Design a protein around this ligand. Structure first.
Ligand code: MV4
Ligand code: MV4
Ligand code: CA
Ligand code: CA
Lengths: 445, 445
């Protein structure tokens, strides 16, 4: 019920956002780099504005150019997608100050959940279980620090509050090492983020990565939409996601989900979001929140019947969420494979012309991709070219349908990670379910 | 739980059958004409046998060659798909006599529901409502005939029992014409089918084509899977199908569905089937039964969660249907567009090389097609190249998603009927729902 939306993103998620806009009769403005003129969503959009040359810093991260796009088109709202400016509170602030709706939370709440210490504080206050830790930043008084570490038990992990993606993290296995690890992490944190704030958690040695999807609206409603297991990853890059998380009962989901929904109301959350947990020894530990739509949102859609991007658009127009918690039932199982233009062993990007695309289909097969026969994958951005999503009444059907869909898929003229997906899907530990976050790297070693 | 299946068909349905086989770990034998060597399902099958040259009569209708294929491969069963030999009782007889399972009903029951008079007799005996009519074949005693016609009320329609596809049908508007119409229809029936048997029904002037999907198993179970509205058609060729039928309540569905399921048990039906009704003035009238999987089966799959081809395979292996009637709930709405290689106004076939295919995707979009970039559509068979299927929580969402999916679809180097689909979907009468079987021809005139 917004009239015109600026799609402040590219590739598959820009197409996903365009499809939601068109279904709702919302006009589309595609802002694009010089290199993305032939993107599928650009070709489909009602209006197009070039916002700069190919490099990200000059185009998709260009805050003045994106806001000027909304200004000259008379747009009502900006959808930032994921990556780029989606979790930039300064961008969100400039968008609302400039008279447009940011499709996401308020700038205040992005900054609060963006800072890991303040995020944990707020979840703890809401009764969301957190990793045992310093519960606040650590001192330089090493005597205090060693007692904290002793209470928690080694190994512990020192984290930058302004950290992320594995940069500002140090595992500590014994006390004789604690002192310099805090001081070093503190120094690299101030050097990198201009933010020397660090905290300690217990280091969980073999967790699963389980994340809970929420929506919260401007009507005081908040819902949980089960969870995703994103454990199948390599050096901080997710490869395969699934929903629901194997081993999670409806009883456990309702408990942890309701605490998440409750925390949304407490913090005045607005839009789609994700509570990231580490899951180990049948217990949940909050680590951080994503204040954006995520890559792997389709697996949640396939097991709940919810259109997450459409709910984003409704919530931004000031409408309530289109359903209630009791209306949500988990049905069956969904798998997603991130198909990347990369070497399947070296993970070196594989840019170039797709000479032939053959996308799979049939019952329970979903294909989310901007890629087409004769499209050139550019060097300037990430390597993701498609998300192949399968549904089944059971986990086993979902896996077998993914195997059959991958065997039908042809991407000619570039390397992809399809051979890696095929290795993962036929792995006996993966077929059993519940492998931890380190499993793929061990398997590859 | 069969080990090896001969796919006695081609094009999209052969691929649909292969996908079901692979999901169940069933080995595939692709029998193919010389012209279909590059069919997608042939390229994917475990084994391939050329059963003759390109013409249908010499290949897909070649009963000895198909049975010899099952013999040399040690296959257990034959899936006939739709068209070709799927409703040929002589073929079904030869398959079971030769020691293989025919994926479909017994030969006796194909012949019974294949003959329109004996079919109506059996439905009438089961308490399935039928068009008022002669209730049996008509005499040559015109005095008897005129009294029958008088009882029913003009206009009436004379039909060949061995008829179908509009060949052996004569509308009669007044009594002074009845006598020769019976005698002429009788003469063309004996000349065509070597079967001079004809019956009368009341001629329904503005009906909808509503059909009920069933499964019946070797365990005495029979289920109904709501219904499809297939009214959007031109000169006996379906163009757009939808499920459920607009205006049909759960109360009416349960009544007419249960009578269909009951009739399955009475006649010892086995496998998938379709009860075809004419629906007019809020009443159902059985006209004929299809004893095969149908083109438009995906719309039923999208509103019920049932895998119809997988149930075919289970039932043939002697397993029960995987669910019970009370497990089936209609959820949302589905649309199918038959995409044909044909001129969108003249309907002349458009064979030739597909230089570029761009298939649509995203949430609620399903693509069932054997077509790929660089595939040549042959002249020898039907013009269907793809089925585009959309799901929505409402009829309105299903239609809008079909419009958006069609606008994304590119088939380069041949003509298609995509422009006709686009005309149909934006028609205000179609958006309101419930248009009769004559509507598309009037619109086109
Ligand atoms: N207390 C505690 N214990 C174990 C952890 C293990 C990781 C971790 C390390 C390496 C890969 C990962 C992939 C998914 C989820 C977590 C990880 C981790 N990360 C990765 C980056 C940052 N978001 C946090 N934090 C952890 N925290
Ligand atoms: N009593 C009575 N009243 C109206 C009918 C109208 C048709 C008919 C005529 C023309 C197109 C059709 C399309 C779908 C369904 C039916 C039709 C019809 N058909 C078409 C071929 C054959 N299967 C029967 N039978 C009818 N029977
Ligand atoms: Ca995060
Ligand atoms: Ca029929």
């Amino acid at each position: 019920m917004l009239e015109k939306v600026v799609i402040a993103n590219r590739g598959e998620i820009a197409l996903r956002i365009l499809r939601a806009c068109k279904e709702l009769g919302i006009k589309t403005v595609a802002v694009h780099s010089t290199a993305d003129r032939d993107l599928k969503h650009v070709l489909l959009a009602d209006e197009t504005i070039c916002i700069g040359p190919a490099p990200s810093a000059k185009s998709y991260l260009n805050i003045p150019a994106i806001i000027a796009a909304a200004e000259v088109t008379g747009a009502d709202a900006i959808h930032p997608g994921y990556g780029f400016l989606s979790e930039n509170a300064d961008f969100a602030e400039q968008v609302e100050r400039s008279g447009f709706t940011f499709i996401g939370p308020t700038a205040d709440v992005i900054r609060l959940m963006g800072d890991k210490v303040s995020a944990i504080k707020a979840m703890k206050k809401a009764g969301v279980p957190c990793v045992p830790g310093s519960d606040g930043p650590v001192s330089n008084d090493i005597a205090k620090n060693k007692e904290i570490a002793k209470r928690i038990g080694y190994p512990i992990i020192i984290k930058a509050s302004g950290g992320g993606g594995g940069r500002g993290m140090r595992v500590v296995r014994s006390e004789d090492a604690l002192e310099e690890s805090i001081a070093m992490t503190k120094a690299e944190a101030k050097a990198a983020f201009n933010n020397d704030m660090v905290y300690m958690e217990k280091y969980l040695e073999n967790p699963r990565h389980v994340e809970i999807q929420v929506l919260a609206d401007t009507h005081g409603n908040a819902v949980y939409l089960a969870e995703r297991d994103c454990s199948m990853q390599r050096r901080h890059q997710k490869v395969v996601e699934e929903a629901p998380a194997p081993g999670i009962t409806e009883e456990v989901r309702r408990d942890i989900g309701s605490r998440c929904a409750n925390a949304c109301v407490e913090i005045g959350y607005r839009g789609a979001g994700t509570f990231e947990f580490l899951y180990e020894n049948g217990e949940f530990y909050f680590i951080e929140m994503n204040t954006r739509i995520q890559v792997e949102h389709p697996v949640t859609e396939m097991i709940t019947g919810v259109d997450l991007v459409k709910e984003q658009l409704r919530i931004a127009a000031g409408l309530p969420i289109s359903f209630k918690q009791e209306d949500i039932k988990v049905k069956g199982h969904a798998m997603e494979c991130r198909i990347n233009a990369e070497d399947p062993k070296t993970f070196l990007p594989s840019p170039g012309k797709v000479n032939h695309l053959h996308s799979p289909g049939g019952l329970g097969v979903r294909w989310d991709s901007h890629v087409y026969g004769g499209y050139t994958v550019p060097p300037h951005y990430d390597s993701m070219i498609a998300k192949l999503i399968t549904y089944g009444d059971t986990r086993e059907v979902a896996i077998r349908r993914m195997q059959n869909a991958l065997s039908e898929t042809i991407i000619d003229g570039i390397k992809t990670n399809i051979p890696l997906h095929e290795l993962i899907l036929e792995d006996e530990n993966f077929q059993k379910g519940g492998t931890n976050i380190h499993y793929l790297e061990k398997k590859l070693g």
